[PDB]
């Protein structure tokens, strides 16, 4: 699967770590169900079919379920000397994993619903980052679900841009960038007109999307030693860059 002799002008490699942090949260603020699905993609461009030993903080704690690419062979006269493999050239999916414990949720979102009779409806949602203040969360979107009978809505937001979509029955609040341990808020006034008085509105949860540049399992790459017997070069010769990307997945709250 790394067939023939590979040949390149400068031997470097790139690791991508990709994690989707799923979360259902109660309106008070209780982590009641949440997991992170994960995958490690490796774009290795190196000369001659080499050996690699890859490592990371399992047992700095945590890791539920996982699977490796067929190249990996975890056992040689019993046990494991980490993940140990003969990488194919270019881009491939090294391993795919899941984790539930020691969970590191990037944002915490807090609703405040308050009704004036059955005519008006006051809303204030607040979002807080819970990661390094030096880091750069992008593509933030907060979707606040309006009722199906809505006369009209009024909205203002401290950071970002927000607007009520009639079709989608939700206010869509977008923020281009936000850094860690910072706070922002949207507050909204929703007008109504009550019809049937029985189907009392199964209040949908507030959904969030975000890309973050950290792995919300808590995983970090410890090392990946590259060795090559046939040729002369090895692990100090290779230039190694790593990247963590935290996709949203399903990130609900106010349920």
């Amino acid at each position: 699967w790394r067939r023939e002799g590979i040949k390149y002008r400068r031997n470097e490699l790139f690791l991508d770590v990709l994690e989707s942090v799923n979360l259902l949260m109660s309106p008070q603020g209780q982590v009641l169900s949440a997991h992170v699905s994960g995958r490690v993609v490796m774009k290795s461009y190196l000369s001659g079919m080499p050996e690699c030993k890859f490592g990371m903080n399992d047992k700095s704690i945590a890791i539920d379920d996982c699977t490796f690419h067929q190249c990996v062979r975890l056992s040689k006269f019993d046990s494991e000397r980490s993940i140990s493999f003969i990488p194919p050239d270019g881009e491939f999916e090294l391993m795919r994993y899941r984790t539930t414990k020691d969970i590191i949720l990037p944002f915490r979102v807090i609703p405040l619903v308050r009704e004036v009779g059955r005519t008006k409806l006051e809303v204030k949602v607040v979002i807080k980052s819970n990661f390094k203040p030096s880091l750069l969360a992008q593509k933030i979107e907060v979707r606040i679900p309006t009722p199906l009978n809505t006369s009209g809505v009024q909205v203002i937001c401290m950071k970002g841009k927000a607007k009520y979509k009639a079709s989608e029955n939700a206010i869509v609040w977008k923020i281009k960038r936000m850094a860690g341990m910072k706070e922002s808020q949207i507050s909204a006034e929703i007008e109504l007109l009550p019809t049937n008085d029985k189907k009392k509105w199964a209040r949908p949860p507030i959904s969030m999307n975000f890309e973050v540049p950290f792995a919300p399992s808590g995983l970090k790459v410890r090392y990946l030693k590259v060795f090559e017997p046939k040729l002369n070069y090895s692990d100090h010769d290779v230039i190694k860059w790593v990247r963590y990307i935290g996709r949203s997945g399903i990130y609900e709250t106010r349920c």
Binding site: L15, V242, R243
Partner: peptide
Amino acid sequence: DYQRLN
């Protein structure tokens, strides 16, 4: 972003 790993 891409930062370096020893």
